[PDB]
Design a protein around this ligand. Structure first.
Ligand SMILES: [Zn+2]
Length: 46
């Protein structure tokens, strides 16, 4: 993440991929489901 609203709010869970945090587990687990679908990046080698 670059910069959001929350600043002094520690969450119980955290994403190791980017750093996204959520209140519940299942809430985060899904946030990782997108880290796979769009994982294979690379349109061209310039
Ligand atoms: Zn993430």
């Amino acid at each position: 993440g670059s910069s959001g609203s929350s600043g002094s709010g520690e969450r119980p869970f955290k994403c190791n991929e980017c750093g996204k945090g959520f209140g519940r587990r299942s809430h985060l687990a899904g946030h990782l489901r997108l880290h796979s679908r769009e994982k294979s990046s690379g349109p061209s080698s310039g």
